[PDB]
Design a binder for this molecule. Structure first.
Ligand SMILES: NC(=O)C1=CN([C@@H]2O[C@H](COP(=O)(O)OP(=O)(O)OC[C@H]3O[C@@H](n4cnc5c(N)ncnc54)[C@H](O)[C@@H]3O)[C@@H](O)[C@H]2O)C=CC1
Ligand SMILES: NC(=O)C1=CN([C@@H]2O[C@H](COP(=O)(O)OP(=O)(O)OC[C@H]3O[C@@H](n4cnc5c(N)ncnc54)[C@H](O)[C@@H]3O)[C@@H](O)[C@H]2O)C=CC1
Ligand SMILES: NC(=O)C1=CN([C@@H]2O[C@H](COP(=O)(O)OP(=O)(O)OC[C@H]3O[C@@H](n4cnc5c(N)ncnc54)[C@H](O)[C@@H]3O)[C@@H](O)[C@H]2O)C=CC1
Ligand SMILES: CC(=O)N[C@H]1[C@@H](OP(=O)(O)OP(=O)(O)OC[C@H]2O[C@@H](n3ccc(=O)[nH]c3=O)[C@H](O)[C@@H]2O)O[C@H](C(=O)O)[C@@H](O)[C@@H]1O
Ligand SMILES: CC(=O)N[C@H]1[C@@H](OP(=O)(O)OP(=O)(O)OC[C@H]2O[C@@H](n3ccc(=O)[nH]c3=O)[C@H](O)[C@@H]2O)O[C@H](C(=O)O)[C@@H](O)[C@@H]1O
Ligand SMILES: CC(=O)N[C@H]1[C@@H](OP(=O)(O)OP(=O)(O)OC[C@H]2O[C@@H](n3ccc(=O)[nH]c3=O)[C@H](O)[C@@H]2O)O[C@H](C(=O)O)[C@@H](O)[C@@H]1O
Lengths: 342, 342, 347
């Protein structure tokens, strides 16, 4: 039979979930949906005809989805995942999996303890552009890696923060790093390797929010590479750049675009057949741009059919969450913060 | 009459100075050359017909240049400049002006006290590209500046350091930040304003030298902007980039190329005449690539001729020298180092 | 200018315990060098030394420099005088051969070096073990990349110095004059860290005076990290029961393993490399050689000094060479005193 998914939180990103599932809606279906907001609740059942619950506990008491998708305010992810795990179901959390390190740790434990799956959505990893780099690195083509820089120079006006009380709060959301660039902070670990320590500066330069809208982290990996990630939601007058550059002994790559959609530099000491898949990898990522979930849910659904291991499990999500925390302790504390965290 | 320059150090950069003085042949001439190495003193003689000395002290007992140009190993610059000033002549010091903060302050006090002028060579400040950026920043066209990123991704092979013992040594050179990237570190204070603090990592990842071939500094300006400068001489397989990117409230500029020589992104809320100077700045800055000494001399000569004041006098050199020093202290000590220095 | 047309004239300052190896090393090159002068503050050691040498005696360094003509002065005094003696020697315009270590304080060692630089004189620092045949072979393999990436380095100085050693002279075991186990005895071994393996990034040290009645440490340990990433330690005590047990270095890498044991890095014990080299056959011979000049190492060091002074060479261990180990000792002594990692290079 089909995987029964239920969706908690019917908001802005909910549609890509409904979208990705329905796109597989022959190895799975969307059976229930949940939101504490009458209107958005209405709207979503109106849109899918799954059974509407106006809170998670009612949905868990009565529904029977094999797996709940958390698309609520991020700070509620860990508590929801724990309740969902207590009711004995699998968990797909949107990113970031938590706004606090200890909550992130508890979610993973709770899921371990209940013997249920915990997936964290990191769809950007399935960019064709990014996949090429990943394989490049995996096969040793860079040889020793030396310098890595990530820019996220995007835009978010006051209105965007004002559309929802939770937005920009430490407890629910985090700032530009935890929310918008968490996808890029993820590359750091996933693509180049384990990070040894970071130092960061952040501030709230212009928006009325609690968290940061701007920041920098210098980074040092365990194998010794160094680098920065540089992030603002204040760019004028719109998204300028979402990029990663990686320089090594025998390889140089830059993945440009507004979202790591365009490989601008690709140079290597020795040839490999991927040298010729560049223009069209730029092709597939740019046309899936903003719609990586379908591909995400194909690994979910394969892992649940006992076919695969999850590509992004709770522990994987902890990698990026540890880094954000490091960056946030560094900025608040004015001190280098090393990994892994206690 | 023509201004009379002496050159101290007839090594690799000597030709560009020779080049540039001859190019103001009617306002000045190279009268004296000096190198402690018989062989390149000879050839610098053959090629200019100026009068050769074999030590600076003899050139100063016997010669009469109004201005001596120090193109020796950087660690020698402060000690030569003190001797020169002591002998009542003007100092043109190649970059960087010193390798130790204290030596730099000392060379400044001696030029002050002797009544001599002290110029530090930062030719890049003359780039037509950066002059437009400077002017937009001074006219306030960016509004509040928020994020600044600078990359120096260049290539020096081991055979480049192997050419002269002085190279890559802490005493005489410093590493990739203090030698090659100082023109870029120079930009942080010159264009964007006083820096408040830095945190840096550096390392010798590949070259056989004392100092770093690779590094990153995270930075916070007094006005609140944050940024980073990322540097490496290990780029594959040759120079990739020398770039500055500045994002403010109503402005977004990026100067790309291998050497801040092509304005790549230029966007502003309100228009201004210079908007139309851009293709010109790019052609002119790129066309003088490898050769901006001519332009630097113009000001040097305009100033000795009692016209202007120095674009880059000794305290100006002190500005990047202080940042370079905070970067090195921070990288060595693993802490944020704040300015101004003791 | 080089001294090419007449034997080098050396002067010896300090006629105490090690002076006898200098006097005899110099005499072992009687054809290129001679000892013409000797200076001691102690009427009687000077007495012994003149009768012993037939050199001209002087009872203070000022006098020896005012009336003497030596081309180079050898500094064989308590370690904390070397800086100040080297600066006055240099102001009178002659070369300086300073005994190890070149000073006991970082700033004094910098000032020694600057002074010689601005006098245009040579400053050599005695580091005889560098000429050891065993350590030369290791140096050669490290220099031709035979170890690959170096990972782990350990150095042991497990030696014996009884209280009566320290009491023999008042200056011994004092911070100002001597320093402790690290700065006096194991400095030849601290020297190997940078000389052999490469630039040190930082150290953490514990030291203590566990038994001797002296000021400085008689026992300690330093943890190390190198800039290229290897780690290791240096383990030092002058309290070994009942006499010297070990003076050793072990270097471990991707394709090389080397251990130099003995009481004084005089006997290569382990030696394994991924790819063969003629030097592989030179080991037993190098052991026998280094062992055979155990205690009499100076003759070899002076070969190089004389060459350098004759214009043949650059010195193997000049002033800056000598600052490299002074800087580690300083870092090790500041780390022990303050309880924090001390990174290099020093301000
Ligand atoms: N992977 C990705 O590309 C993206 C991930 N996200 C993440 O997904 C989550 C999406 O947030 P958005 O859709 O963008 O903001 P949102 O405000 O549009 O979503 C709001 C929905 O959740 C509801 N909600 C609030 N409290 C609830 C509760 N206790 N129970 C159930 N529903 C509750 C809101 O009333 C509304 O129904 C966030 O964690 C965000 O980081 C968001 C966009 C993209
Ligand atoms: N502004 C710019 O674009 C550039 C600046 N530089 C800077 O210029 C200086 C020169 O660098 P290079 O030309 O690359 O290296 P270099 O090694 O090629 O030039 C060295 C010359 O100085 C001589 N020398 C050494 N000691 C001396 C002394 N006491 N007196 C007189 N001569 C002495 C050497 O024998 C040699 O011929 C450094 O400060 C370097 O950073 C270098 C290239 C470009
Ligand atoms: N390279 C090596 O293997 C060895 C190096 N050394 C070093 O060489 C120096 C030798 O110390 P030792 O001979 O063992 O101790 P020491 O006490 O035996 O010799 C000291 C001599 O210096 C004389 N002296 C003291 N003050 C003087 C002054 N102001 N001017 C001239 N002479 C003065 C003393 O009167 C005494 O005769 C020390 O730095 C020691 O670390 C010592 C033994 C071996
Ligand atoms: C994969 C990925 O990057 N996901 C992140 C990403 O998603 P998504 O791509 O959907 O953002 P979307 O581009 O729609 O712009 C959002 C608003 O910005 C405003 N916005 C946007 C762009 C711009 O140029 N100007 C602008 O005002 C405009 O108001 C837009 O409505 O932005 C999400 C977010 O910020 O909440 C993050 O939660 C995600 O993790
Ligand atoms: C304006 C400016 O950037 N000045 C700095 C700059 O000057 P200059 O303009 O001469 O650089 P130039 O590029 O010609 O090659 C230098 C060597 O690099 C090697 N080099 C260079 C590029 C490359 O791709 N590969 C390479 O090997 C090449 O073989 C060359 O021999 O480089 C100097 C330096 O590093 O010593 C710095 O001191 C200056 O501050
Ligand atoms: C090359 C080298 O290691 N140099 C260092 C070395 O020199 P040198 O070879 O002369 O030492 P020497 O072996 O004679 O023992 C010295 C006394 O130790 C006592 N000693 C020695 C061995 C032992 O087992 N027991 C013992 O009591 C016994 O009293 C010895 O008389 O020891 C010098 C010192 O300590 O002042 C250091 O300054 C040198 O830098």
């Amino acid at each position: 039979r089909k995987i029964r998914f239920g969706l908690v939180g019917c908001g802005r990103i909910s549609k890509n979930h409904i979208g990705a599932i329905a796109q597989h809606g022959d190895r799975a279906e969307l059976v229930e949906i949940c939101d504490t907001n009458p209107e958005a609740l209405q709207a979503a059942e109106a849109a899918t005809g799954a059974r509407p619950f106006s809170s998670l506990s009612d949905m868990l008491a009565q529904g029977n989805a094999d797996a709940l998708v958390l698309a609520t305010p991020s700070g509620l992810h860990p508590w929801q995942a724990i309740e969902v795990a207590q009711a004995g179901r699998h968990v797909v959390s949107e990113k970031p999996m938590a706004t606090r390190w200890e909550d992130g740790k508890r979610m993973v434990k709770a899921c371990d303890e209940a013997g249920v799956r915990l997936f964290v959505v990191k769809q950007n990893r399935r960019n064709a552009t990014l996949q090429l780099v990943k394989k490049a690195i995996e096969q040793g083509r860079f040889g020793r890696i030396y310098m890595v820089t990530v820019n996220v120079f995007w835009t978010r006006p006051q209105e965007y923060y004002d559309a929802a009380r939770w937005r920009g709060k430490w407890e629910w959301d985090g700032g530009a790093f935890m929310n918008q660039a968490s996808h890029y902070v993820d590359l750091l670990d996933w693509l180049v390797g384990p990070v040894e320590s970071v130092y960061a500066y952040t501030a709230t330069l212009a928006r009325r929010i609690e968290a940061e809208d701007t920041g920098v982290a210098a980074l040092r990996w365990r194998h010794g590479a160094m680098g920065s990630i540089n992030v603002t939601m204040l760019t004028y007058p719109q998204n300028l750049e979402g990029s990663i550059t990686i320089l090594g002994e025998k390889g140089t790559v830059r993945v440009g675009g507004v979202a790591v959609n365009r490989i601008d530099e690709w140079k290597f000491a020795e040839p490999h057949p991927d040298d010729d898949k560049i223009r069209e990898a730029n092709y597939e990522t740019t046309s899936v741009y903003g719609f990586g979930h379908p591909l995400y849910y194909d690994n979910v659904i394969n892992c649940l059919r006992g076919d695969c291991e999850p590509e992004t499990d709770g522990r994987e999500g902890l990698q990026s969450l540890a880094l954000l925390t490091a960056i946030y302790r560094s900025a608040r504390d004015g001190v280098r913060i090393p990994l892994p965290l206690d």
